[PDB]
């Protein structure tokens, strides 16, 4: 049953790509002040779950949902900017830059590991196809 | 239903998989949204493995046919 | 066109370049008395918006206007 490794590692690659994309989106908007609806940008993060249907022992990984990060919104005193609060408290995203950079590095490394898994699995499938010949 | 039918079904399945991978690759090269390079590359990998399986089955089948036709009656 | 990560990071680079340009133009005109018409120079600000192409999921940064 080496074919299931294709599904497992492909799901892992897709999930890590989504995680890296979300981390990069958070990082690129660390300095944002406004959203499309006027709301401040809220740092977002993916949720990882075991991609196993009920009764399946072990599977790959899947992104359940994207959730707003739990952290206080960064308050900035700029009661001159057109966007402000009642007391001039501009709300800026709660992005922790070090966390996002480390997340990007971790996602890249896990991605590369899954690529190696896929490569060696394909090599083994070819060798198995050359069983008796 | 029959052996020829099973072989035709296997060939159709392999060709359909290869065509699906090729179509997804062309869609990605087109720039259409939602198609990820990960899926393209994995599907091309799977199509290559399936093609190799079909080639091996053909090789053996031909070898067995040659062996049977070599029988002296 | 661009891959999603490429677009996001390139938009971030362009937005930061625009903000740096606004800051440099303000720092140059710190002592200007008049413009080309006879009105004082007004400090420019750049507003970052999130270019959420999908619904609330992700997106780079765009600049609506200065």
């Amino acid at each position: 049953a080496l074919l299931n490794i294709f599904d497992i590692a492909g799901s892992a690659l897709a999930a890590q790509s989504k995680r890296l994309n979300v981390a990069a989106s958070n990082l690129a908007n660390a300095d944002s002040v406004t959203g499309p609806d006027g709301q401040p940008y809220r740092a977002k993060q993916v949720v990882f779950q075991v991609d196993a249907a009920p009764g399946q022992a072990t599977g790959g990984v899947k992104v359940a949902s994207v959730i707003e990060s739990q952290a206080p919104e960064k308050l900035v005193y700029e009661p001159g900017n057109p966007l402000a609060d009642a007391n001039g408290y501009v709300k800026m995203p709660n992005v922790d830059v070090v966390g996002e950079m480390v997340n990007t590095m971790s996602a890249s490394r896990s991605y590369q590991a899954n690529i190696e898994v896929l490569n060696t699995v394909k090599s083994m499938m070819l060798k198995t196809l050359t069983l008796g010949q | 239903v029959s052996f020829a039918g099973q072989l035709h079904a296997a060939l159709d399945r392999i060709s359909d998989r290869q065509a699906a991978a090729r179509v997804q690759a062309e869609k990605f090269t087109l720039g259409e949204p939602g198609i990820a390079l990960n899926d393209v590359m994995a599907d091309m990998q799977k199509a290559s493995v399936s093609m190799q399986m079909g080639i091996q089955v053909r090789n053996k089948l031909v070898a067995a046919y040659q062996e049977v036709m070599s029988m002296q009656v | 066109a661009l891959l999603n990560i490429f677009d996001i990071a390139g938009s971030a680079l362009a937005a930061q370049s625009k903000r740096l340009n606004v800051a440099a133009s303000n720092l140059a005109n710190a002592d200007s008395v008049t413009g080309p018409d006879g009105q004082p120079y007004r400090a420019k600000q750049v507003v970052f918006q999130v270019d959420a192409a999908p619904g609330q999921a992700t997106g780079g940064v765009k600049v609506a206007s200065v």
């Binding site: 897709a14 994309n21 | 949204p33 990820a36 | 891959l3």
Partner: peptide, 13 residues
Amino acid sequence: GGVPGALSNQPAP
């Protein structure tokens, strides 16, 4: 689904 992958073509078409 809701989130497109990093290695996907710009969601904006």
